[PDB]
């Protein structure tokens, strides 16, 4: 149990099944693959209400997963390996970008007649 104040004013989504990341090289992907349990199955945004763009979104959604998941852990008896936060940086973006187009679109369809 942590004091979760870093965050303050953020959302934490559902879990989901896990990323398939197509990494470009073979064994990045069987790497992942074979640990991939170790890396998280949610991501924690701010509400898409004050945001703009998805780069900057993408960047700080990343910036506050991997800063819980490299935290909660190193509290503990934990360290992350520079392989692991490369891995974990592309499943942590590939699951808040799909977080970020889901919630932008409940948004998008209020935009519409909603």
């Known amino acids: 149990g942590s004091v979760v104040g870093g965050l303050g004013g953020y959302m934490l989504g559902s879990a989901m099944s896990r990323p398939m990341i197509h990494f470009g090289n073979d ?8 640990n991939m349990y ?10 898409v209400d004050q945001y703009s763009n998805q780069n900057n979104f993408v960047h700080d959604c990343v910036n506050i997963t991997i800063k819980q998941h490299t935290v909660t852990t190193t509290t503990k008896g934990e360290n992350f390996t520079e392989t692991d ?11 808040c970008v799909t977080q970020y187009q889901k919630e932008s679109q409940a948004y998008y369809d209020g935009r519409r007649s909603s």
């Open 85 to 95: 936060v490369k891995m974990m940086e592309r499943v942590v973006e590939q699951m």
């Open 27 to 34: 064994w990045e992907d069987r790497y992942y693959r074979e």
């Open 38 to 47: 170790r890396y998280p199955n949610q991501v924690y945004y701010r509400p």
